[PDB]
Every structure is written in structure tokens, then in C-alpha cells.
Amino acid sequence: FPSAVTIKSWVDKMQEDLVTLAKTASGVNQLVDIYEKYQDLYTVEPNNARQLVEIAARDIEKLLSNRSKALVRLALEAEKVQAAHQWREDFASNEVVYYNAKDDLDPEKNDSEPGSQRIKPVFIEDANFGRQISYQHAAVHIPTDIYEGSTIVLNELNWTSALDEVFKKNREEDPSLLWQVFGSATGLARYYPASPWVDNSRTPNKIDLYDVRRRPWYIQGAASPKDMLILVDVSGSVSGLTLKLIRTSVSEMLETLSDDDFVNVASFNSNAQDVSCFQHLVQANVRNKKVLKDAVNNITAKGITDYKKGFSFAFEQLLNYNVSRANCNKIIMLFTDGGEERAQEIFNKYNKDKKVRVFTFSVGQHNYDRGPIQWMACENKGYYYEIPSIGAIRINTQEYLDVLGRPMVLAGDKAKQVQWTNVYLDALELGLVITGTLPVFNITGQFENKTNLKNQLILGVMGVDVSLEDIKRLTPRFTLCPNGYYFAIDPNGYVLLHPNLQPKPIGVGIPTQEPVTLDFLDAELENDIKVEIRNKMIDGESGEKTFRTLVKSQDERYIDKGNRTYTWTPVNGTDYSLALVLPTYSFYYIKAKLEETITQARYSETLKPDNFEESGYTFIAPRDYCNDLKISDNNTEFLLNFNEFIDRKTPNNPSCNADLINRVLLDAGFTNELVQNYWSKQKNIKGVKARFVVTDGGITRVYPKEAGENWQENPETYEDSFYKRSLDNDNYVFTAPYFNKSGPGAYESGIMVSKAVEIYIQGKLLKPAVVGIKIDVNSWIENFTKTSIRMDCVILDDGGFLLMANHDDYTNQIGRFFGEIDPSLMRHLVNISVYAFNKSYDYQSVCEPGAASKQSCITEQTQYFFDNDSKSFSGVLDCGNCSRIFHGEKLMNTNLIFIMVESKGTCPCDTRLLIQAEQTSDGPNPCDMVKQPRYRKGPDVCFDNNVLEDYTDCG
Numbered sequence: 001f002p003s004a005v006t007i008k009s010w011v012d013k014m015q016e017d018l019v020t021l022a023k024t025a026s027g028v029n030q031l032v033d034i035y036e037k038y039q040d041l042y043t044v045e046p047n048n049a050r051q052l053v054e055i056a057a058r059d060i061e062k063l064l065s066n067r068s069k070a071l072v073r074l075a076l077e078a079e080k081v082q083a084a085h086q087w088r089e090d091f092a093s094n095e096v097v098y099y100n101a102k103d104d105l106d107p108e109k110n111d112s113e114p115g116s117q118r119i120k121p122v123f124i125e126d127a128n129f130g131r132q133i134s135y136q137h138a139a140v141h142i143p144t145d146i147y148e149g150s151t152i153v154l155n156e157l158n159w160t161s162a163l164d165e166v167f168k169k170n171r172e173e174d175p176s177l178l179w180q181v182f183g184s185a186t187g188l189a190r191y192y193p194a195s196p197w198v199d200n201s202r203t204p205n206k207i208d209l210y211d212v213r214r215r216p217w218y219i220q221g222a223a224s225p226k227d228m229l230i231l232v233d234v235s236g237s238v239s240g241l242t243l244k245l246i247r248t249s250v251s252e253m254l255e256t257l258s259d260d261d262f263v264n265v266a267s268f269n270s271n272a273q274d275v276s277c278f279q280h281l282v283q284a285n286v287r288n289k290k291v292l293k294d295a296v297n298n299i300t301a302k303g304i305t306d307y308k309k310g311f312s313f314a315f316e317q318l319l320n321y322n323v324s325r326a327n328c329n330k331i332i333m334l335f336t337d338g339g340e341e342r343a344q345e346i347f348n349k350y351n352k353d354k355k356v357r358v359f360t361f362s363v364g365q366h367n368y369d370r371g372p373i374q375w376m377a378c379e380n381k382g383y384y385y386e387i388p389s390i391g392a393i394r395i396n397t398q399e400y401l402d403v404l405g406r407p408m409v410l411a412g413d414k415a416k417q418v419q420w421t422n423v424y425l426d427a428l429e430l431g432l433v434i435t436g437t438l439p440v441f442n443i444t445g446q447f448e449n450k451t452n453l454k455n456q457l458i459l460g461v462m463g464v465d466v467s468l469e470d471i472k473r474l475t476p477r478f479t480l481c482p483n484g485y486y487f488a489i490d491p492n493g494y495v496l497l498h499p500n501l502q503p504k505p506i507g508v509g510i511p512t513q514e515p516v517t518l519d520f521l522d523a524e525l526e527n528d529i530k531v532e533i534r535n536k537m538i539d540g541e542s543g544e545k546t547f548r549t550l551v552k553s554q555d556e557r558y559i560d561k562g563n564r565t566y567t568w569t570p571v572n573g574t575d576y577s578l579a580l581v582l583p584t585y586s587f588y589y590i591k592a593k594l595e596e597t598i599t600q601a602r603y604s605e606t607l608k609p610d611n612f613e614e615s616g617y618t619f620i621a622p623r624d625y626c627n628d629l630k631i632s633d634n635n636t637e638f639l640l641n642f643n644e645f646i647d648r649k650t651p652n653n654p655s656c657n658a659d660l661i662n663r664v665l666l667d668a669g670f671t672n673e674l675v676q677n678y679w680s681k682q683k684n685i686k687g688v689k690a691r692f693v694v695t696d697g698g699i700t701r702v703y704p705k706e707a708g709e710n711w712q713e714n715p716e717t718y719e720d721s722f723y724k725r726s727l728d729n730d731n732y733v734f735t736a737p738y739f740n741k742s743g744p745g746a747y748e749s750g751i752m753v754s755k756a757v758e759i760y761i762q763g764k765l766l767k768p769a770v771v772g773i774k775i776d777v778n779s780w781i782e783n784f785t786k787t788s789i790r791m792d793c794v795i796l797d798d799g800g801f802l803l804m805a806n807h808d809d810y811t812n813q814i815g816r817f818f819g820e821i822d823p824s825l826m827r828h829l830v831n832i833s834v835y836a837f838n839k840s841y842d843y844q845s846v847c848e849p850g851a852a853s854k855q856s857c858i859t860e861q862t863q864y865f866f867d868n869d870s871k872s873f874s875g876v877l878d879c880g881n882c883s884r885i886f887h888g889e890k891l892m893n894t895n896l897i898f899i900m901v902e903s904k905g906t907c908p909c910d911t912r913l914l915i916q917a918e919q920t921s922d923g924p925n926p927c928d929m930v931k932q933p934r935y936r937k938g939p940d941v942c943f944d945n946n947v948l949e950d951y952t953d954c955g
């Protein structure tokens, strides 16, 4: 065992060698002084985060107010044109002409109902929607389980033509509108841009179960937030088919509860108990709904019924005010079959002011008495539903929600307020959208008062979709550092907008149409400062906060010790709150002063893929430079069209943004001046395998043009993990290649090395680019084993990944996590606390399904980093019945640590492994997360318990 000073100087000499090689070949200084050499070619401008947040909040509120105005127009016209409708029973004499969405494109003259003539439209391909779109009329969706020629459906299809016309008007005053739709309460759905239904028109194994009245936006706009409590009657008499139907019905009832709704499930048989681990009303989000569904699926029937001990439990759990709730619409859902017990005194004791509804469901095919079941609904403002078989399950849930909207109708114009739903995946696939709803009231008898029989029910709900990518375009991101970004938030803390929000459903457990509800604390790493910021944003305040944050790298494999500054404002007129993350060095950006029309041309000439031998292999970020350019995943295609458009650019002045092209051309020119005046004068270094420079404008020219085929970084520089990592870290960062990845690999590509330029203009810190070297593995291993005369030696970077070693069998598994190699040293070296680790959760990850294609689960990813700042570490590894010695030295001015451990093939301490990998897991235990739930602000105004409501419709 060499002494500490010997291997200390050893590490010092390797770090001197590596730093000198990287600094020379990379040419940080040459790119720097090129950047300061042309201060007359640009201007440095500030990123006033306060004004940026205010501007983006104003823009988003303007967009949402535009959609609100569209909704108001549509709802007013719907009410007016249904008020003046004449009921009919004969449509043979007067056909209704409409386009049915699930019509085959074949010119079939025989696909018409008696009372309806079908339109055959001319479908154009549209860029906004990505489907066939006809602007000449609205399309109609009628569920399969609903006949499309009955009297109700035919009358609705008759009076919705004015809706069609107002659809046209709305789209004519605002060409950016997406799907705008009337969700009828008869089952129909009439959206304006006529497009064929998704895949379910006529396709085997593609059945169309879509029903507009179950959709989250319809569920949301049809009533006010609930406080359910599903009483399931698991007694003896419900065994067999009845219990199957009850558990399916409870699942389908839970599938109609939003995140503003609170629900628990109880079950009684001579004794009432909770079916799950929850002891009170919990929020009805995806995780809690799954827990309740599992508990209901795991339920068995036994014992004698007792309707008094069950309703006592229900009324007691609805009297709990210690927990978070939505103090509104208290309900009891009784899932029984029948009995001769009315329990008058329980109701008279607990529900005497009749503050709580009771919806009773007589599930099953049986001959038990159904009188008390129908009476509990009458004396408690409820309604009585029957579920004789699966297939009747879907319709009755929509129907209690039909009942709950009576108090909302009676409040004439105080109940017509626009509400936006959680981020969900559109049916007519558009990606991620939020829908703004407004309910439509039946106003036939009004100011000419008639019997007004069913004037307490809504006609439907009008929705208009806002694309999430449409919100993303109101928050311009390219004037910020690749580490700076915007994000918005719900009142529940979910993110309207965030870089880590992907168009995938939220995972809920282990694999074996829910909304994309991703909390703010789960889209990032969670400190306590971030909990304070989240609570401040939910309340709708404004403020600033500068602090130190662990910023996880994009590749989800490292953690860096960042330096952030959150500024937030509420978006006026809505429930959303916008914030802007901004690094401390990102307060200034370079504004390209390209107005010569010739300098930009001599910059542009560098970009055709015919000069890729004096200038490096060029990739361009597929940004929206001009709208006539379509971004392409195949990058060289986009480069070709970019060159083509640059060839004739001058007349396209208003067609596109000048700033992006000016900056990208300026950066291309600077990169060319670097690659010729410093890289083309040398042409060859033994150690290097590739020299690259990546710039925020989009230029990522890699020099040799040979490793450019081995280059696997994203063309858009703002999504380059190493580029974002190297800006926060003001030092050299080595990115260990991927292990066991099918492709160019590591030997014939090298290992990535990078440092970020740190130029100063007017005494301001701004970092416009990164340079780097793809050091070859052999040219390092020879130099590492060259000095061995002056075996177990390993090099580790941040995250504990083996960059390279000496045993020559570890170098076979290069880049692989060191804990997978010898986990005992990994655990011990963590125990010294040189490597801290953070374990977090990824709710939006694809997942291989096991046993009890790929589903989505919650994966539990961990990342390691330098816990302490100390440089020298020594100790003894107390292996089981043996002893091992190590010394650790962190190379100065890099992210590396050298471990001098001398022990191979000793007694087996390889009991387990430290597998730093995206491990499949269950999420946090929900039974423990509902007792300290995250802060959350419920909706303010809700409508229940009106005195004009006519309860004599128990059905």
C-alpha cells in the first residue's frame, strides 16, 4: 500500500495531464476571446424575470379569456335556440341532415337512417390537428349503445344546427381554436371541425366505448365538487352475480370523480367498516382511486345486513371536519340489492335538515323488496337507480350526476362560470389539452312561466380545447439558459406546464382515460423551500426566492448543486399561477445584431453539407426559425431546408422571427472561426478522438466528421444533458458513456469531456456555449497504466460511474455503475459520506409488465453525487471475515475521484448489489400520504341545497 502523499502526487499528475489536454484541444480560451473579439456584433440584454413572468401571465390570461368568450357565445346561442324548439315525433317528412363521425368513407347511399340523411364531407389535411378536417360543418358522435334515430336523438340533431353555425363564427374570429364541442345530455357530442372518429368507426377489436357524459370536462361542468361515501352492502344475500355487479359499479362510479372530489368507501354487514386503509374522506386522485378500487375488488360477501349501523357510519364520516375536504355536495351512495328495512330514525337523527343526499342503487337480478330502497332516495333528496346487469352500469353514474345539477340550474347566471380541467389526453388525438367548460341550461319556460317540468336539468356542457403546446408558445424559452424555464400550477399543485411533463398516463403501481395529473413536487426534486414556494403559488401570491437547489440532470443519471431564482405571479382571471426558474448566471443573454445582410450570408454559407471537411459535421436545432420550415427528426433533412430557405430569405420578413435566425447565424460564424483558426491549424492529437462545440443558438459542429456518425446527441442544444450540466458546474464534467447499449458504443466513440465557456462582457457573467473532447479510451488507459511502474485502480466520476480502470476487465464494463462492479466498496464509500444519494419517483415511465405491450408504472430512480467537498479519503473496508484497504483522492478541477483499493478475489462480500437503475416500484404508500396531505386550495363557489328544487322525481 503506497502512502497517501505518493498516490496524491500520482493523482495530481494525472489531473494535470487531463486538464492540460482538455483545455488545449477544447480551446476554451480561443472561443472565449473570439466571443469578446466581436462585442460590436451583438448586444447583451437582461432577463428581468419579473417582467417576463408578468408578460407571460398576461398572454395566458388573454388566451383563456378568448376561449371563455367563445364559450359564452356558444352557450348563449344554445340556450336561445333550444328555447325556441318545437317537439316532434315525425322526421320522415322533414329529414335531419348531419354528418355522423363514425361513417365509413365509402360512398354508400344505403347507410342512412329513416329520419336522417347523412352528409358526406370533403376532408382536407390540417397541420394544427393532424387529421382530416372539414370546416364546412360539425360532426356528431353517437355512442353505440344509443340508437341514432330515436325521438330524443333526432330532436337534438335538429336543434343543434345553430350550434354548428356559431362554431363556424367562433373559428372565423379566432383561427387558433381547437375542438369546440357541445356535449349533450342525451349522449350526443357535436364538435366543430368535422373529423372522423379516432379508430372506432367500424373496426374489429376497436370498439367505441366513448361517452361524452363520462368525460372529465363534462363531469366537471355538470355539477359542483362532491363528498361521496359509497356504502357497499356486502352481506350474505349479495353473493354471486350481485357482488360482481356491485364491485364493477363501484369501480365505474369512482371513475367519475375528479381531483376536486373527496370519497371514501364503506361496507356494512351487521357492522360497518372501511373497505380500505383510509379512515376518512380522501381526495379522489389516481392513486387514492386505485387504492379504493383494489379494496372493492378484494371484497367478499358474508353476514346479515344492518342498514342502521351502516348509515350511522356514513353520516359520521360525512361529519368529520378535521380532514381536508370540499365542503359541498355531501352524498351517500348505497349499493345494496333490497330489503325490508327503512331506518327512518337514523335519517331523522343524522339527516333532519336534509343536508345529505342519498342515492340508492338496487344492483342485481333478484326478487327482493325494493320499497325502502326507493323511499330512502325520496326522503333524502336522492334518486333510485337499478343495475340489473353489466351494460346498465355505465348509464346510471352519469345519471346521479344529472341529479346533482339541479341546484346549479336554479342559480341562473351565477352558475355560468368558465372552468378549466386537469391536463388530459385528447380523444381525437391532439396530445395534451385542457378543456374549458360551461353548462347549458334548459330555458323553455322562462318569464312566460309554465309547468317547467324538467327545467331543472342542464341541456349539456360546452367545451373548447386549448392545446398544451399552444400554451407553451406563449412562454418563449430560447432567451433563457437551457436551465431556465417556466412552469404553471393548479390550486391542487398539479402542473399545467413543466419540462418534465410528458404526454403519457400517470403510473399508479406495478403493471400486471385518466388525466395527466402530475404534482409540482413530483416533476422536480423536493426540498422544503420548494414546498414553501408551492404553497405560496397555490395561494395566488407573488414573490421572488433565490436559493440553492439539487438540479437533476436531464439524463436522469446525475445530480448537480444548482443555483436558482424562482419568481412567480398569479395568472389573473384563472386559478393558475405562473413561475419562472432562472439561474443566477442566466440574467443576461446575447442579442444578435445581424443587420448587414451580407455578414449573415457569409455565416450561412458554412452550413451546406458539402463543406463538412474544413468545418465540422454540422447539426442544427430543429427550432421554429420560420413557419414554412417543418421540423424533422431526420436532422440533415432540416439542415437542407434551412439552407434552402436561407438562400431566399429577404422577402420572408413577417413570415418568421428574425431573432432566432440572427442568433443561430452569429453562433455559426463564431463556431466556424473557432474550427478554422484553432482546430484546422492542428488537425490531429493522439489522445483526442473528437472535438465538438455546442452553442445555445443551435450550432453543434463536431470536427472530424468521422465521430459525427458516432455522435448521438440531440440536435436541439437545450435538450443536451451534458450542456445543461456543464453550465451549472463551472468546471470540467466527464459524462460516462452508456453500458451495454446497442450502437456505436464507447471504444470506437470515446468518452465525453466538456467545459462551458464563461466569457465576460461589460463585467457580466454569461455562458453562451460549451466546448468538449471525446477522449479515446485506449489513449487514456495506456497513460494510466504507463506510470504504474513509477492490480486494482479505478476512476469514478459523479454518480459513482467507472470512467476507466487498470485491471482491463473493468474497462470491458466501461461507463457501468461502480456499485454493480464491487458493491461492498460502494456501500462503504457511501458510508464515509463522500457520495450522497437522492431517491425519487418517475410517474410517467414505460414499464415491463410482470406476473401475479408495456404498461406504465412508477419507477424509482436514484442518483449519486459528491456529498462533501473534501479531497482525500482513506480507510479500511471491513469485509466479512477479512479486511480491505482503500484511499480516495478527488482530482482537482474536475468531477473525478480516484480510488486506490488493493483487493481482488477476496472472501465474498458480494451479498447484494447497489443497482443505480430506473427500478420498477410502487409509489409512496398512499395510506400514509393522506394523513399529511399536500396543501391544496379547493374551489370557492359551489351550488347545493336549493329550496326551489323539486325532489318529487325519485325515479
Ligand SMILES: *[C@@H]1O[C@H](CO)[C@@H](O[C@@H]2O[C@H](CO)[C@@H](O)[C@H](O[C@@H]3O[C@H](CO)[C@@H](O)[C@H](O)[C@@H]3O)[C@H]2NC(C)=O)[C@H](O)[C@H]1NC(C)=O
Binding pocket: 016, 017, 018, 020, 021, 024, 686, 687, 775, 776, 779, 780, 782, 783
Ligand atoms: C497520455 O498520453 C500523453 C503522454 O505523452 C498525454 O499527452 C501529453 O500530456 C502532457 C500533460 O502535461 C503534455 O505535457 C504533453 O505535451 C503537451 O502537448 C501539448 C499539445 O498542444 C502542448 O501544448 C503542451 O505544451 C505540451 O507540450 C502531451 N503530449 C502529447 C503528445 O499529447 C495524453 O494527454 C495522455 N492521455 C490522455 C487521455 O490524457
Ligand SMILES: *[C@@H]1O[C@H](CO)[C@@H](O[C@@H]2O[C@H](CO)[C@@H](O[C@@H]3O[C@H](CO)[C@@H](O)[C@H](O)[C@@H]3O)[C@H](O)[C@H]2NC(C)=O)[C@H](O)[C@H]1NC(C)=O
Binding pocket: 087, 089, 442, 443, 444, 445, 452, 453, 454, 455, 459
Ligand atoms: C327542456 O324542457 C322542455 C320543457 O321543460 C322540454 O320540452 C318538453 O319535452 C317533453 C318530453 O319530455 C314534451 O312532452 C311530450 O310531448 C309530445 C307531444 O306533445 C308527446 O307526444 C310526448 O308523449 C310527451 O308528452 C313536451 O311537449 C316538451 N315541451 C314542453 C313545453 O313541455 C325539453 O325536452 C327539454 N330539453 C330537452 C333537451 O329534453
Ligand SMILES: *[C@@H]1O[C@H](CO)[C@@H](O[C@@H]2O[C@H](CO)[C@@H](O[C@@H]3O[C@H](CO)[C@@H](O)[C@H](O)[C@@H]3O)[C@H](O)[C@H]2NC(C)=O)[C@H](O)[C@H]1NC(C)=O
Binding pocket: 526, 527, 550, 836, 837, 838, 839
Ligand atoms: C437528497 O439529498 C440531500 C443532499 O443535501 C439530502 O439533504 C440532506 O439530508 C441530510 C440527512 O437528513 C441532512 O443532514 C441532517 O441535518 C440536520 C440539520 O443539521 C441534522 O440535525 C441531522 O442529524 C442530519 O445530519 C442534510 O442537512 C440535508 N442537506 C441539506 C442541505 O439540508 C436529502 O436528505 C436527500 N433526500 C431527499 C428526499 O431530499
Ligand SMILES: *[C@@H]1O[C@H](CO)[C@@H](O)[C@H](O)[C@H]1NC(C)=O
Binding pocket: 054, 055, 057, 058, 569, 572
Ligand atoms: C393581476 O392583478 C393584480 C391586481 O388586480 C395586479 O397587481 C397584477 O399586476 C395583475 N397581473 C397581470 C399579469 O396583469
Ligand SMILES: *[C@@H]1O[C@H](CO)[C@@H](O)[C@H](O)[C@H]1NC(C)=O
Binding pocket: 059, 062, 063, 066, 173, 174, 176
Ligand atoms: C384573442 O382574440 C383576439 C381577436 O379575437 C386576437 O387578436 C388575439 O390575438 C387573441 N389572443 C391570443 C392570445 O391569441
Ligand SMILES: *[C@@H]1O[C@H](CO)[C@@H](O)[C@H](O)[C@H]1NC(C)=O
Binding pocket: 081, 094, 095, 158, 159, 160, 161, 162
Ligand atoms: C328543426 O326542424 C325543422 C324541420 O326540419 C327545421 O325547419 C328547423 O330549422 C330545425 N331547427 C333548427 C334549429 O335547425
Ligand SMILES: *[C@@H]1O[C@H](CO)[C@@H](O)[C@H](O)[C@H]1NC(C)=O
Binding pocket: 298, 299, 300
Ligand atoms: C385482500 O386479499 C388478500 C389476498 O387475497 C386476502 O387474504 C385478504 O383477506 C383480502 N382482504 C380482505 C379484507 O378480505
Ligand SMILES: *[C@@H]1O[C@H](CO)[C@@H](O)[C@H](O)[C@H]1NC(C)=O
Binding pocket: 319, 320, 321, 322
Ligand atoms: C376531530 O378532532 C377533535 C379534536 O381534535 C376530536 O375530538 C374528534 O374526535 C376528531 N374526529 C372527528 C371525527 O371529529
Ligand SMILES: *[C@@H]1O[C@H](CO)[C@@H](O)[C@H](O)[C@H]1NC(C)=O
Binding pocket: 546, 547, 548, 563, 564, 584
Ligand atoms: C450561487 O453560487 C455562489 C458561488 O458560486 C454562492 O456564493 C451563492 O450563495 C449561490 N447562490 C445562493 C442563492 O446560495
Ligand SMILES: *[C@@H]1O[C@H](CO)[C@@H](O)[C@H](O)[C@H]1NC(C)=O
Binding pocket: 634, 635, 636, 637, 640
Ligand atoms: C434524411 O434526409 C436526407 C435528405 O433527404 C436523406 O439523404 C437521408 O437518407 C435521410 N435519413 C433518414 C434516416 O431518413
Ligand SMILES: *[C@@H]1O[C@H](CO)[C@@H](O)[C@H](O)[C@H]1NC(C)=O
Binding pocket: 831, 833
Ligand atoms: C454507516 O454504517 C453504519 C454501520 O455499518 C450504520 O450504523 C450507519 O447508519 C451508516 N451510515 C452512516 C451515515 O454512518
Ligand SMILES: [Ca+2]
Binding pocket: 235, 236, 237, 238, 304, 305, 338, 339
Ligand atoms: Ca341482505
